[PDB]
Amino acid sequence: STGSATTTPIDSLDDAYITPVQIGTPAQTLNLDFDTGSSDLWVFSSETTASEVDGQTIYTPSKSTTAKLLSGATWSISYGDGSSSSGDVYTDTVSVGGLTVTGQAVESAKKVSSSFTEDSTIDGLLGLAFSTLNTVSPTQQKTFFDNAKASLDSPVFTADLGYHAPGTYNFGFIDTTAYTGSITYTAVSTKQGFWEWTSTGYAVGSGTFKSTSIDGIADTGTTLLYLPATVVSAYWAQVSGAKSSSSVGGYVFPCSATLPSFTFGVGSARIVIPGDYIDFGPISTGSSSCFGGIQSSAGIGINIFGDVALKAAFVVFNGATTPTLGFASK
């Protein structure tokens, strides 16, 4: 089997991407944030505290003839941005782009934090990291991909995120028309439950490539690119007027700037992030200071190849017995 679904930016800045997902019988379609940095499939629901729902579409398990409460199972997750959610668990039928899993754990939110409430466009998350990170207790549950893997034509999924435009998540096949050149594959460590890999270096603009190992995670659920302070300082030094602002919480730059590109290495191959992908717009409405899309990972404890990086590539998440990651230009 295979599946293919379009993923769409939630806003004009590509702050996140949503993908329609069918849950239950008859189908209830919710728009979920596919997150290769976490391993829970959770949804706003009829059980979510009413004051914490503000425009999201909800899953109502009582209206699904295939939903079954998973007795005694609860979940609770916190994300790197400080947001969180928790609740109970149903098993139900879940379909993405024509690919169907029966018996998928659907984690129904009883509580969500304010950032989730304040984002009316995201109805939940669909985790695509390794199932060892799943938070359901006392019996850990499998991700959608892990449940589907054996049925897929090939045990892979691909992320093709657009810049200011829709893109695609494919399951079970590699669309050879979706990229240019070849796909370069690189080793993955699953020891922390992430798609963790080592970039071979970087360049700023037309500058010389610096060969240096940068361990990090491929995380579609993180918007920005978080890299070591030395790398980030070298990037913003090429932008007149850019500075690190403690009050704003990162590097900011004049909105009038034209930003340089940023290149990262994948083995001997190179992925070029155009400068415009690094502009996240005014820091507050009407400001002429803009928020940078490349930020320091100091104090995060891990480097994160988020959407800013991933959207410049066609990315293969190879879930074979020994997982690997592939990157192609596009």
What keywords describe this structure?
mainly beta; Cathepsin D, subunit A, domain 1; 4 helices; monomeric; 330 residues; 7-stranded mixed β-sheet; cocktail experiment; hydrolase
Brief description of this entry?
With 330 residues, this protein is mainly β.
Task: Describe the overall structure.
This protein is mainly beta. The chain folds into two domains: 5-174, Acid Proteases (Cathepsin D, subunit A, domain 1, Beta Barrel); 175-330, Acid Proteases (Cathepsin D, subunit A, domain 1). Helix content is 6%, strand content 44%. The chain has helices spanning 114-117, 144-148, 229-236, 307-310; strands at 3-9, 17-23, 28-35, 41-43, 68-78, 84-96, 99-112, 124-127, 156-160, 167-171, 184-187, 196-204, 210-218, 225-227, 243-245, 250-254, 262-266, 269-273, 279-282, 289-292, 294-296, 303-305, 314-318, 324-328. The strands form three sheets. A seven-stranded mixed β-sheet has the order 18-17-12-13-22-14-21. Strand 5 (68-78) and strand 6 form a beta hairpin. It is globular, with a radius of gyration of 20 Å. The protein starts with a strand and ends with a strand. The PDB classes it as hydrolase. The entry lists the keywords cocktail experiment, hydrolase. It forms a monomeric assembly. Cocktail experiment D: fragments 308 and 333 at 50mM concentration.
